[PDB]
Write a protein that binds this ligand. Structure first.
Ligand SMILES: *[C@@H]1O[C@H](CO[C@@H]2O[C@@H](C)[C@@H](O)[C@@H](O)[C@@H]2O)[C@@H](O[C@@H]2O[C@H](CO)[C@@H](O)[C@H](O)[C@H]2NC(C)=O)[C@H](O)[C@H]1NC(C)=O
Ligand SMILES: *[C@@H]1O[C@H](CO[C@@H]2O[C@@H](C)[C@@H](O)[C@@H](O)[C@@H]2O)[C@@H](O[C@@H]2O[C@H](CO)[C@@H](O)[C@H](O)[C@H]2NC(C)=O)[C@H](O)[C@H]1NC(C)=O
Ligand SMILES: *[C@@H]1O[C@H](CO)[C@@H](O)[C@H](O)[C@H]1NC(C)=O
Lengths: 538, 528
């Protein structure tokens, strides 16, 4: 009749899961658990409501729908883009989370990893192949949780001050899921007193915002920020700019038939089909850029009482352990989405005039003086027009500005203000990687190793890549268990030292053993983090 | 001895025979080329020397123009070699001619030397400017003049006739006119005159390049460690008026006519004693009275003039020493001394920057600290010493010279560039200063051939090389010897220059190209 391992009772009612086959053995998965009431109709743009209790058994046996989002059509049928696109139907009914647990269920409380996906706050889903938790859970005996959260207008359109579209509800979705983990993870054998958040890109930025928001900060203990930071220039927006964007979107879909009473405007927005909002959301940006990020978290005093930059500087982070890192070529991926002269299908050897144009697109919304400063810093004046060099330099501009330097600034301030910080640069280019060689190790391509995807037999990774994947999973689980990625009791293994504002040490992650190195693009980031904001005042 | 008797338009001269290790040389030292600029003539353009009867005694150097005397390290060779070595006088407008013995009987190419000293000091009589070795070795005629410095040469009340400014530059021009009219009497060829100069002397040369009435007085130019577009080399009309006015107040003077008349009653030495504290801020530089851009001598700023010029038909030799900034740091950069290693702290570095780069905004200063900090070693004392040296040298010498070279080459000129990288075995400054500002000059003039001095045999050969490059350039506009690794022209693209040291010429690219992008391309956009 029934199998007890696959049955669990959470506060809301009963659930039935599936037994998953992994190369190392069985795992229990409960996929598609509802944690909020569906944010439908009148509940569009509103904070999430906790899921009301149910009778009978909910089947948590497959991933639920993807939240409504734009679908990338740049390179149709190309694996490099398609691997990030929705693999379930789009629905506004998307507030479900997923729990993976060992088979049989742990008998003593087990550390929990909670994954928050990225996608620029306009896309992403917990159901992507590359976020499959079955391999981590099996290899390291942790519980893994991932949630869906609203993106785009649905998650971050804000008319600040109003009750009908207060903004940041996508982050509130993440918080509700975190509250759910507190109240329920024990039922799966998980330890609500050992919860580690981790996420990549917009997911990392979200992790960081939970760090800086007191009502979230109580729901977890440790944090991992992969290739993103809450102080990233794309990651937040001001109350005014948020309103301008909300309002422009409304206008574009015929709402108020501009501005006016917020209640009327939002009610008119609620009558539009989801797909219509999605279709117009690319229009609301002030400048042509490679960062299609129309709606993102808003600094409005509520979720964030001040800018993330400010909150970081003012904060006491004693008793916090954090793991942070970046891939070797953060910038390259983004360049084929707009920068003149770039394509995945040629060498993208750009001209100097193409380089100058690329700087404005890769660093949108800075003054001409600031742009000049960028061009000066990144030009090699002994070779000002070498196409190969200009390509590399532009990739560095985009990467440094949007990822590496926000991450370095976060790491430095946290370390100096009480946190134990560990830092990495991921340098392995997958044998399976379908992007061209000149892109190096692009944004996003460490995730599949962290989740242990190369252990999937149907995939064609090398045996060394399997070993490497197992190393990374070990570091992450070590960090989740102890706050330290280092092998507890292993001495002949090279040691990963803490990152500090002075020595600035980090390790390289590739097939070779750990190599300790200094500075996260230190010269470059002094420009973005120390000088450029002073040029902003005067 | 008839070789020592010469008649110039003004009258008759008696010179002196000098010895060198290579043979004799004829020298005519202390020739008057202007009426003495004294009493009512203080601050005025030079008047041509009125003819004389009898024979001028031209066997010894004449007086040094009034100037501050450096007392930072009394008795120290490294500083005393630049101080006056004759008595001070406002009666100082004399020039000197060295020529082969016996005097050439066919037109010989002429080198004309303009000394540096921040426009506040210097003299043609310093040992290190001794023309005898160049003249014997390379058979040129060599001329050097004294020109008025400090307030006496560059105090300006723009618009006034009583003190129009730039008269020290006019002293230089008048001497160049003198050379046109009289150098043939010594065997010199007035159709082959090369100007060379170091530091403010180099800025002077460049200024003559950019001023049409001077441009007809010479044919080729050498600019050593200085350039007319240097941030210290000129002053705007308004700021010149302010500094003049402040000097007047400091010496107790109260209408331009009235002000200048009162200044003219003050002993020269009194003006000198107060010239230092008219500057708008503390600085390692003592540069109160400098050439003023007033539309007359310079119709525009040297920067503007350089950008707008057609320089086809010009050949220029330019260069710098390896460590331009180090020398200046011991004159007021906190934590610096010639007598210790000058290992400064970061706070001292930050302070030093405001002193090495005066009168720029905080934002500008921050940018300087950004560019020159190694953010992996932000506090290493040795690295900080080196970087502050870099800052001062880049800003004041290397990047103005680089900009001048690039623009001239891109606008028709043929440019040759060098970096001078030999530290003299006899150098009396500490080792951490490397090759400091001014210490190529003694090699160019062949001072190492003086047997009474203690240079090595390698060093004498080196000097001979440098004398040959320089005279080659004066004769043909090309320093190269026959095919020897060749010295290529400097171009805005390839940016090639050669290293001058004991080794053969090594060709390299870029005169601190990354650093000078900061000073020459970015920083101007900021101040807008
Ligand atoms: C490299 O590619 C870009 C992108 O163009 C597309 O991708 C190429 C691989 C190739 O398949 C092209 O036919 C595609 O159009 C090129 O930039 C484009 O150039 C075309 C023609 O000049 C122009 O109309 C587009 O606007 C350009 N697009 C952008 C984003 O600038 C680039 O020239 C290619 N470099 C080569 C071929 O050397
Ligand atoms: C290196 O020397 C400087 C200069 O000080 C002078 O030269 C020294 C060799 C010694 O003879 C001192 O007595 C001289 O004053 C030092 O900077 C000075 O430090 C003292 C310390 O109180 C201070 O009073 C002076 O104002 C400083 N002078 C300047 C120009 O900043 C420097 O500390 C020495 N470096 C060392 C000792 O490591
Ligand atoms: C907006 O309109 C609604 C519709 O009746 C009204 O109740 C509300 O008071 C209005 N909002 C404000 C701020 O006045």
């Amino acid at each position: 009749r029934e199998d007890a391992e696959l049955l669990v009772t959470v506060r809301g009612g009963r659930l039935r899961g599936i037994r998953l086959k992994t190369p190392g053995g069985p795992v229990s998965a409960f996929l598609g658990i509802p944690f909020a009431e569906p944010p439908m109709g009148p509940r569009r743009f509103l904070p999430p409501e906790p899921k009301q209790p149910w009778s009978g058994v909910v089947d948590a046996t497959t991933f639920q729908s993807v939240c409504y989002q734009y679908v990338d059509t740049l390179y149709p049928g190309f694996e490099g883009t398609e691997m990030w696109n929705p693999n379930r139907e789009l629905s506004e009914d998307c507030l479900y989370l997923n729990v993976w647990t060992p088979y049989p269920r742990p008998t003593s409380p087990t550390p929990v990893l909670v994954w928050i996906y990225g996608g620029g706050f306009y896309s992403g889903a917990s159901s992507l192949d590359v976020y499959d938790g079955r391999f981590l859970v099996q290899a390291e005996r942790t519980v893994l949780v991932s949630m869906n959260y609203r993106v785009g207008a649905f998650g971050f359109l804000a008319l600040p001050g109003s009750r009908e579209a207060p903004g940041n509800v996508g982050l509130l979705d993440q918080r509700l899921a975190l509250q759910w983990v507190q109240e329920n993870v024990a039922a799966f054998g998980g330890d609500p007193t050992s919860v580690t958040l981790f996420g990549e890109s917009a997911g990392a930025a979200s992790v960081g915002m939970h760090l800086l928001s007191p009502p979230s900060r109580g729901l977890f203990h440790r944090a991992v920020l992969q290739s993103g930071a809450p102080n990233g220039p794309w990651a937040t927006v001001g109350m005014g700019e948020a309103r301008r964007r909300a309002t422009q979107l409304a206008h574009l879909v015929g709402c108020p038939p501009t501005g006016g009473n917020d209640t009327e405007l939002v009610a008119c927005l609620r009558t539009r089909p989801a797909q219509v909002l999605v279709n117009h959301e690319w229009h609301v940006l002030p400048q042509e850029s490679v960062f299609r990020f129309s709606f993102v978290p808003v600094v409005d005093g509520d979720f964030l009482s001040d800018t993330p930059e400010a909150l970081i500087n003012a904060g006491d982070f004693h008793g916090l352990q954090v793991l942070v890192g970046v891939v070797k070529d953060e910038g390259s991926y983004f360049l084929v989405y707009g920068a003149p002269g770039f394509s995945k299908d040629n060498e993208s050897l750009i001209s100097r005039a193409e380089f100058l144009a690329g700087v404005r697109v890769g660093v949108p919304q800075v003054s001409d003086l600031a742009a000049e400063a960028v061009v000066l810093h990144y030009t090699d004046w002994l070779h000002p027009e070498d196409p190969a060099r200009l390509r590399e330099a532009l990739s560095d501009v985009v990467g440094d500005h949007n990822v590496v330097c926000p991450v370095a600034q976060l790491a430095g301030r946290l370390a100096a203000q009480g946190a134990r910080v560990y830092a990495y640069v991921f340098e392995h280019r997958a044998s399976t990687l379908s992007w061209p060689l000149w892109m190096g190790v692009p944004h996003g391509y460490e995730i599949e190793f962290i989740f242990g995807i190369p252990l999937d037999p149907s995939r064609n990774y090398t045996a060394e890549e399997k070993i490497f994947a197992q190393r990374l999973m070990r570091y992450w689980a070590n960090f989740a268990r102890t706050g330290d990625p280092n092998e507890p009791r292993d001495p002949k293994a090279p040691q990963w030292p803490p990152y500090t504002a002075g020595a600035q040490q980090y390790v390289s992650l590739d097939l070779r053993p750990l190599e300790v190195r200094r500075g996260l693009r230190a010269q470059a980031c002094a420009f973005w983090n120390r000088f450029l904001p002073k040029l902003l005042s005067a």
